[PDB]
Amino acid sequence: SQIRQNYSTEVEAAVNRLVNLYLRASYTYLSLGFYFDRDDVALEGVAHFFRELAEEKREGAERLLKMQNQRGGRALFQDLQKPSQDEWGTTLDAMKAAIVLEKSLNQALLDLHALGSAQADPHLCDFLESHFLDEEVKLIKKMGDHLTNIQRLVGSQAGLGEYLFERLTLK
Amino acid sequence: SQIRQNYSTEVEAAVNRLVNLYLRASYTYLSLGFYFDRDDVALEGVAHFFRELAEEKREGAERLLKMQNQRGGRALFQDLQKPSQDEWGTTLDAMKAAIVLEKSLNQALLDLHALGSAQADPHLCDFLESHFLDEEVKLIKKMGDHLTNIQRLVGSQAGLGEYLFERLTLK
Amino acid sequence: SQIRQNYSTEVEAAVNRLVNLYLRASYTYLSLGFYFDRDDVALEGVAHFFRELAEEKREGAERLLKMQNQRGGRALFQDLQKPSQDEWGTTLDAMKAAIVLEKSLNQALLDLHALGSAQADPHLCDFLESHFLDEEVKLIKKMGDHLTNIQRLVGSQAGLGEYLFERLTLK
Amino acid sequence: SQIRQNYSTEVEAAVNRLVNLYLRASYTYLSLGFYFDRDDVALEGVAHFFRELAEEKREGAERLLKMQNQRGGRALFQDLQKPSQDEWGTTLDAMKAAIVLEKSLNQALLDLHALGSAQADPHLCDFLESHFLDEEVKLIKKMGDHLTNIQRLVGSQAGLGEYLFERLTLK
Amino acid sequence: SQIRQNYSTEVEAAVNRLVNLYLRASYTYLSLGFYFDRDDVALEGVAHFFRELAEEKREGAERLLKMQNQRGGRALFQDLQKPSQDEWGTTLDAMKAAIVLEKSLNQALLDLHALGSAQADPHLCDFLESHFLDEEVKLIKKMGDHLTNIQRLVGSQAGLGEYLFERLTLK
Ligand SMILES: [Pd+2]
Ligand SMILES: [Pd+2]
Ligand SMILES: [Pd+2]
Ligand SMILES: [Pd+2]
Ligand SMILES: [Pd+2]
Numbered sequence A, B, C, D, E: 001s002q003i004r005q006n007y008s009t010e011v012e013a014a015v016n017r018l019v020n021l022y023l024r025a026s027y028t029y030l031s032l033g034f035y036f037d038r039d040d041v042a043l044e045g046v047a048h049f050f051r052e053l054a055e056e057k058r059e060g061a062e063r064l065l066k067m068q069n070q071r072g073g074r075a076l077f078q079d080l081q082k083p084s085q086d087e088w089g090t091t092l093d094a095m096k097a098a099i100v101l102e103k104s105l106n107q108a109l110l111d112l113h114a115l116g117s118a119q120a121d122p123h124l125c126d127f128l129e130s131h132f133l134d135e136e137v138k139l140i141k142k143m144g145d146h147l148t149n150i151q152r153l154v155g156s157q158a159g160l161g162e163y164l165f166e167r168l169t170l171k
Helices: A009-035 A044-071 A091-118 A122-154 A158-168 B009-035 B044-071 B091-118 B122-154 B158-168 C009-035 C044-071 C091-118 C122-154 C158-168 D009-035 D044-071 D091-118 D122-154 D158-168 E009-035 E044-071 E091-118 E122-154 E158-168
Strands: none
Touching: A009 A044, A009 A091, A009 C044, A044 A091, A044 A122, A044 A158, A044 C009, A044 E122, A091 A122, A091 A158, A122 A158, A122 E122, A158 B122, A158 B158, B009 B044, B009 B091, B044 B091, B044 B122, B044 B158, B091 B122, B091 B158, B122 B158, B122 C044, B122 C122, C009 C044, C009 C091, C044 C091, C044 C122, C044 C158, C091 C122, C091 C158, C122 C158, C122 D158, C158 D158, C158 E122, C158 E158, D009 D044, D009 D091, D044 D091, D044 D122, D044 D158, D091 D122, D091 D158, D122 D158, E009 E044, E009 E091, E044 E091, E044 E122, E044 E158, E091 E122, E091 E158, E122 E158
């Protein structure tokens, strides 16, 4: 590289790790998306919600990789761990798992921003805010809103509430 | 016929039987369709679902008959057995009966494809795949999805669940 | 599942393995795509070629997963092995690696088709032909065409030939 | 025939021979066209050039046959000799072979025109000029132009020159 | 000024210096742009590339001056040093000089951002990121990409490579 400037080896490594985290998250959402498409689950709005998230996280990884090259860093890929579950339970179980996942990505972004601040790397810190940190806050708020509505619908008839949420809130 | 080539008498007979099965299935769906239009049943989305299926199965029979003539075989019609029930119970009962019916048609198609493979009749085997086997897989998946949603809606208030499914999923 | 019919456990497992192979191939093409975007490589047409392939292979995996659910099988994900190289050499080296990769996917599809034929599963065999086997033949022919043109351009001035191929054949 | 007038048996026979020559030329160009589409040759602009010529020569034969009937002569077909080569070498080799072929067709047209002049058959002589002799002069000039550019591109790097000609002059 | 708030004399002075650096860079690119328009150089795509950069850097200076006034600081102009060379050598020489120039501007922006961070001036730091630091990263990546392609084209025939790069990559 003849372009690298103010781009630390620590940040370069952390960016590669964040790419792996984003790709893992995409893979997790892919699994969630197909689980809700199972004939014995059959909640299309829920499937669509997670399938859209799979694509968003893949896009996030690609944006990070583009930035790595723009800065003169070098992409290094690692194995992608399979998702933590094969079956994801109820919509409530899935939304809880999704919020946990998003909080972990958000924390990884915050950790990287902190490293950028420590390294005096303003291009990095601003890139993370613009493309990632703002989107995370919005997504987490939406999931929290969803969790609240799912929870209020459990009542004594969980099946009815699960159907209604998918029909009236999602897709 | 001056056109028949590679078209066995076994396949010709099996095609005629499949026509009868398709016409029977259309007749069954016609009965289902009008049952759900009864003033004391009154589930329009369910009626429409079965009425559409009646037309699809009739169309399938006509396609088989066209193919029979294209191959130089001769259509032979048999009596059409009246449907197995006069009254079809709940939406759940009806969807269960519809899945059973579709699985029987699918098995008849698979049996015919096997005969085509045994007879080295690739035009037949491909015709069945293109117009029938793919459609069956899609339809059966949709019915399974429907059954799952119907089942989750039973709860303690079957009437409420039946109304909601018709209103929010169907027609 | 209340829909599964004529869908063997052997095929279901093989479909899950093929999904992993497609996702691995997508990951490989993602790496190839970003390698050619490096400031010290800088062959945009080559990067774009591999980035498009990454998306095609991801789409292929998603189609396989949709089919798995349509048949009543259950998606099971495994770890995704990181790509075989971190740096991909010349356009020629990369195109050779891509052809090798495509031949491996093609062989996996052929192996699965053979299993489908052995299991008398015509829906599976036709699905593979329509969405995968035809596309593979076309893609492999295109890569072979590319390899030939790359090879004729090496001459005594490899740099010149590499630039011209990217400029005049690709993107 | 109740229409034949001023149309000699010599011309009628020569027209049938010219049809055979045109059909042979079409067959030759068909072979050339597919040779350049081989994955180990892969020069699309060259393939397209010869494929277009195959269609032009076929069209020429059909025009001659229409004229034969317009004059009250009778089409008589002979075997079509397979093309002189199975593999056509370089673009230069192929263009040289194509010019040789065109000169032979041009000479056959000139020989027929001479026969028409000898037989005082002005409809024939004008038909040949309008549909064939003018087109031949234009095509031969274009091939000569191509040969010159191909030849100047050989240099010390034949592969580079062959690629550039296909990319920058053809299709 | 009745508007100045949180705007240090150190930042105000540094902004004036950055204006001078931007105007100097514009002047350098103006010289580069006209050099490549010389009849004995005659590389229009290269001239256009540098002429566009001259305008971009002038625009950058004007944006800085507008910001200085928005904050209540006072523009102070200094002499503009003539560019470091009268003749710029090859496209490769020029692109190397341009990357050096951009890295110096980028470092000046980073130094100013650091001063803004030290002075707790978030309006300044964000202004620099938005209008300057992001653009610099993109421009430097593009120049690095260009340098790589120029370098691969040198081979044994520098003239040929220089012509091809101007024709096929630039303007
Ligand atoms: Pd920061
Ligand atoms: Pd078959
Ligand atoms: Pd098959
Ligand atoms: Pd004449
Ligand atoms: Pd700041």
